[PDB]
Structure formats: structure tokens, C-alpha cells
């Protein structure tokens, strides 16, 4: 069920510690040899492999300066670590780093809550960036993944777009139990206009 302590613990650990988060501005990919569903980057001192769902997404960022905002998992192999993998999280760089406050509407066990917000400075952001910033907020404010009282067990993060298209994320999706399994959902690298949507969260 959604009351599995291990999974809740790993899901929380994944979104709580910034250690797992890879944030880099105006970066360009390494001229390495890659497949058609990935792009190798060198962020900080780590080697990062960014995977995408479709093969046409790669071509769009190749040798172009991009902004990265994605969660990552350590790839385990018989070599000197430093190998990390992430899904999506890429958008072309931008000179308009202006601040945008995305309204976050939380329904806490049926009760409407006071207006909350998350900030982003890209005019076009990825769903993943929004989902990450929201979950960090819910963890801090409501402790939705707690393993002592386990007050919460169901919830959804809904990106309510003005274009009649909704992106839904289940706050209690554990994949198979591994981080890459939990992060694969962001592989579509879907992006959206920062000012054309708001967030609706339901937790119980
Ligand atoms: Zn709405
Ligand atoms: Zn709508």
C-alpha cells in the first residue's frame, strides 16, 4: 500500500535532500558519442547522463546552452563512481531570469488552505521542476511522507494549464522501489509557460 515505510522513506529522501538535485545554469553538453535518447553533461565534478522519452527531444538541445533542474540517481557499475543519471529537466537558457510566483492551491483533507506559492525564474519551465518544488514545500509544511504518525497516504499534484491540458502527479508512486524507477516519469521532458497555469494539490 501507500503506507510502506521503506518506499515512503526513499521517496521522501529523494525529494527532501538537495544532494540528489542537479541545478546548473547556462550549461552545454559534452561532445561525446551518445545514443538518440540521451545527452552526457559534466555538472560540478560529476558525469551526468540525461535520458529522454522520445529521440527528437535530444536534437533540440545538442551543442546548445541549457538550464538543468532535475533529480538524479547514482548509476551503480564496476567503476570509480561519479556516474549519475536523470530524466528530462532541460530547457534552453534565457536572459529573462525574472521572477514568477506560481499559485499553489492545497486541499488538506477537504479543507481549502491559504494561498501558497513557489517561485521560478525561467519563462518556460519543466513539469519536473514544478513537481520538485511543490513536493519540497509539502514535505516541509505538511510532512506528507512521515513514517511515525503516517497521517497522509493519498495525494495528487495537478498542474492546471490554461490550455485545458492537465499534468497529474501521484504523490505516492513508488515505481519498483528504485530512484530511477521513480524519476522515469519525467523523461518526457515536458515544458510549460510559467505564467499559463497554477497548481492544485490534494492530500489526505
Ligand atoms: Zn485549478
Ligand atoms: Zn484547467
Short mmCIF file of C-alpha atoms and ligand atoms in Angstrom, two decimals:
data_model
loop_
_atom_site.label_atom_id
_atom_site.label_comp_id
_atom_site.label_asym_id
_atom_site.label_seq_id
_atom_site.Cartn_x
_atom_site.Cartn_y
_atom_site.Cartn_z
CA UNK A 1 0.00 0.00 0.00
CA UNK A 2 0.99 3.67 0.33
CA UNK A 3 1.88 3.05 3.97
CA UNK A 4 5.10 1.18 3.09
CA UNK A 5 7.72 2.74 5.36
CA UNK A 6 10.71 1.93 3.17
CA UNK A 7 9.24 3.36 -0.03
CA UNK A 8 7.82 6.43 1.74
CA UNK A 9 11.25 6.89 3.25
CA UNK A 10 13.03 6.66 -0.10
CA UNK A 11 10.53 8.83 -1.91
CA UNK A 12 10.93 11.47 0.82
CA UNK A 13 14.69 11.16 0.87
CA UNK A 14 14.65 11.64 -2.89
CA UNK A 15 12.74 14.96 -2.84
CA UNK A 16 13.95 16.27 0.53
CA UNK A 17 17.76 16.40 0.29
CA UNK A 18 19.18 18.85 -2.24
CA UNK A 19 22.07 16.42 -2.59
CA UNK A 20 20.01 14.49 -5.14
CA UNK A 21 19.09 17.64 -7.03
CA UNK A 22 21.06 18.84 -10.02
CA UNK A 23 20.69 22.54 -10.75
CA UNK A 24 23.02 24.25 -13.25
CA UNK A 25 22.51 27.35 -15.39
CA UNK A 26 23.73 28.06 -18.93
CA UNK A 27 25.49 24.71 -19.36
CA UNK A 28 26.46 23.00 -22.62
CA UNK A 29 26.69 19.23 -23.23
CA UNK A 30 29.93 17.29 -23.76
CA UNK A 31 30.79 16.48 -27.39
CA UNK A 32 30.71 12.78 -26.53
CA UNK A 33 29.25 9.93 -28.55
CA UNK A 34 25.68 9.25 -27.42
CA UNK A 35 22.54 7.35 -28.36
CA UNK A 36 19.45 9.15 -29.63
CA UNK A 37 17.73 9.12 -26.24
CA UNK A 38 20.37 10.85 -24.13
CA UNK A 39 22.92 13.61 -23.55
CA UNK A 40 26.03 13.48 -21.38
CA UNK A 41 26.81 16.52 -19.25
CA UNK A 42 29.55 17.39 -16.83
CA UNK A 43 27.96 19.20 -13.91
CA UNK A 44 30.17 20.16 -10.99
CA UNK A 45 32.66 17.28 -10.92
CA UNK A 46 30.07 14.63 -11.82
CA UNK A 47 29.39 12.85 -15.11
CA UNK A 48 25.67 13.07 -15.82
CA UNK A 49 23.57 11.08 -18.31
CA UNK A 50 20.26 12.77 -19.11
CA UNK A 51 17.70 10.48 -20.74
CA UNK A 52 14.60 11.42 -22.74
CA UNK A 53 11.45 9.52 -23.69
CA UNK A 54 11.49 10.35 -27.40
CA UNK A 55 14.52 10.66 -29.67
CA UNK A 56 13.53 14.00 -31.19
CA UNK A 57 14.00 15.89 -27.91
CA UNK A 58 17.78 15.40 -27.86
CA UNK A 59 18.35 17.14 -31.19
CA UNK A 60 16.72 20.25 -29.76
CA UNK A 61 19.43 20.89 -27.12
CA UNK A 62 22.52 19.42 -28.82
CA UNK A 63 25.52 21.74 -28.52
CA UNK A 64 23.14 24.38 -27.18
CA UNK A 65 23.43 26.11 -23.80
CA UNK A 66 20.73 24.81 -21.47
CA UNK A 67 19.44 25.12 -17.92
CA UNK A 68 19.14 21.93 -15.90
CA UNK A 69 16.81 21.27 -12.99
CA UNK A 70 16.36 17.58 -12.32
CA UNK A 71 16.63 14.99 -9.57
CA UNK A 72 19.32 12.38 -10.09
CA UNK A 73 20.20 8.83 -9.08
CA UNK A 74 23.66 7.26 -8.81
CA UNK A 75 24.27 4.67 -11.54
CA UNK A 76 25.86 1.57 -9.99
CA UNK A 77 28.63 -0.07 -12.04
CA UNK A 78 32.07 -1.67 -11.68
CA UNK A 79 34.00 1.62 -11.96
CA UNK A 80 35.04 4.73 -9.95
CA UNK A 81 31.53 6.12 -9.41
CA UNK A 82 30.90 9.73 -10.45
CA UNK A 83 28.26 8.34 -12.84
CA UNK A 84 24.79 9.87 -12.41
CA UNK A 85 21.55 9.70 -14.41
CA UNK A 86 18.49 11.97 -14.63
CA UNK A 87 15.34 12.17 -16.74
CA UNK A 88 14.45 15.38 -18.56
CA UNK A 89 14.84 18.65 -16.68
CA UNK A 90 16.19 20.57 -19.67
CA UNK A 91 15.17 23.95 -21.13
CA UNK A 92 17.19 26.30 -23.33
CA UNK A 93 18.89 29.12 -21.40
CA UNK A 94 17.26 32.55 -21.09
CA UNK A 95 18.18 36.20 -20.45
CA UNK A 96 14.84 36.87 -18.76
CA UNK A 97 15.63 35.41 -15.33
CA UNK A 98 12.68 37.44 -13.99
CA UNK A 99 10.77 36.01 -11.02
CA UNK A 100 7.41 34.30 -11.39
CA UNK A 101 5.25 33.21 -8.46
CA UNK A 102 3.17 30.13 -9.26
CA UNK A 103 -0.02 29.87 -7.17
CA UNK A 104 -0.23 26.58 -5.27
CA UNK A 105 -3.72 25.60 -4.08
CA UNK A 106 -3.64 22.98 -1.35
CA UNK A 107 -6.64 20.99 -0.17
CA UNK A 108 -5.62 19.49 3.15
CA UNK A 109 -8.06 16.69 3.96
CA UNK A 110 -11.02 18.51 2.39
CA UNK A 111 -10.08 21.90 3.86
CA UNK A 112 -9.12 24.70 1.49
CA UNK A 113 -5.86 26.28 2.68
CA UNK A 114 -4.40 29.80 2.49
CA UNK A 115 -2.76 30.66 -0.89
CA UNK A 116 0.74 29.20 -1.19
CA UNK A 117 3.34 29.78 -3.86
CA UNK A 118 6.55 28.50 -5.44
CA UNK A 119 8.96 30.64 -7.44
CA UNK A 120 10.62 30.02 -10.79
CA UNK A 121 12.75 32.35 -12.94
CA UNK A 122 12.51 30.74 -16.36
CA UNK A 123 9.69 31.86 -18.68
CA UNK A 124 9.26 28.23 -19.72
CA UNK A 125 9.85 25.61 -17.02
CA UNK A 126 9.63 21.82 -16.91
CA UNK A 127 6.86 19.93 -15.12
CA UNK A 128 9.60 18.21 -13.13
CA UNK A 129 10.94 21.48 -11.75
CA UNK A 130 7.43 22.43 -10.64
CA UNK A 131 6.75 18.99 -9.17
CA UNK A 132 10.03 19.05 -7.26
CA UNK A 133 9.45 22.50 -5.78
CA UNK A 134 5.91 21.62 -4.77
CA UNK A 135 6.85 18.35 -3.06
CA UNK A 136 9.65 20.06 -1.14
CA UNK A 137 7.01 22.51 0.07
CA UNK A 138 4.51 19.81 1.08
CA UNK A 139 7.20 17.86 2.89
CA UNK A 140 8.29 20.93 4.84
CA UNK A 141 4.78 22.24 5.56
CA UNK A 142 2.77 19.05 6.00
CA UNK A 143 5.32 16.25 6.32
CA UNK A 144 3.25 14.17 3.89
CA UNK A 145 5.70 11.27 3.94
CA UNK A 146 6.17 10.94 7.72
CA UNK A 147 6.66 7.37 8.98
CA UNK A 148 5.69 7.88 12.62
CA UNK A 149 2.11 9.16 12.54
CA UNK A 150 1.62 8.38 8.82
CA UNK A 151 -1.25 10.87 8.67
CA UNK A 152 -1.14 11.15 4.87
CA UNK A 153 -1.46 8.30 2.37
CA UNK A 154 -3.11 9.71 -0.77
CA UNK A 155 -2.50 12.78 -2.87
CA UNK A 156 -2.01 14.36 -6.27
CA UNK A 157 -0.17 17.34 -7.68
CA UNK A 158 -2.11 18.77 -10.59
CA UNK A 159 -0.64 21.33 -12.97
CA UNK A 160 -3.80 23.08 -14.11
CA UNK A 161 -2.93 24.61 -17.51
CA UNK A 162 -4.92 27.40 -19.16
CA UNK A 163 -4.83 25.31 -22.36
CA UNK A 164 -7.21 22.68 -20.98
CA UNK A 165 -4.36 20.19 -20.59
CA UNK A 166 -3.59 18.77 -17.15
CA UNK A 167 -0.44 17.12 -15.91
CA UNK A 168 -1.05 14.96 -12.86
CA UNK A 169 1.50 13.50 -10.47
CA UNK A 170 0.71 10.91 -7.81
CA UNK A 171 2.46 11.82 -4.56
CA UNK A 172 2.58 8.12 -3.66
CA UNK A 173 4.04 6.47 -6.75
CA UNK A 174 6.96 4.24 -5.72
CA UNK A 175 7.75 2.72 -9.10
CA UNK A 176 9.57 -0.51 -8.35
CA UNK A 177 11.34 0.97 -5.34
CA UNK A 178 14.47 2.37 -7.01
CA UNK A 179 15.11 6.06 -7.66
CA UNK A 180 15.46 5.70 -11.44
CA UNK A 181 12.08 3.98 -11.38
CA UNK A 182 10.60 6.98 -9.56
CA UNK A 183 12.30 9.52 -11.81
CA UNK A 184 11.44 7.90 -15.14
CA UNK A 185 8.11 9.77 -15.10
CA UNK A 186 9.96 12.99 -16.00
CA UNK A 187 11.53 11.52 -19.16
CA UNK A 188 9.04 13.21 -21.49
CA UNK A 189 10.84 16.46 -20.63
CA UNK A 190 7.51 18.28 -20.86
CA UNK A 191 7.69 22.08 -20.55
CA UNK A 192 5.11 24.80 -19.95
CA UNK A 193 4.75 28.59 -19.92
CA UNK A 194 5.41 29.68 -16.33
CA UNK A 195 2.54 32.17 -16.37
CA UNK A 196 -0.13 30.00 -18.01
CA UNK A 197 -1.03 27.66 -15.15
CA UNK A 198 -1.38 27.13 -11.44
CA UNK A 199 -1.04 24.16 -9.11
CA UNK A 200 -3.77 22.19 -7.34
CA UNK A 201 -2.72 19.76 -4.65
CA UNK A 202 -4.95 17.34 -2.79
CA UNK A 203 -3.65 15.48 0.23
CA UNK A 204 -5.32 13.11 2.68
ZN1 LIG B 1 -7.14 24.53 -10.77
ZN1 LIG B 2 -7.97 23.51 -16.01
#
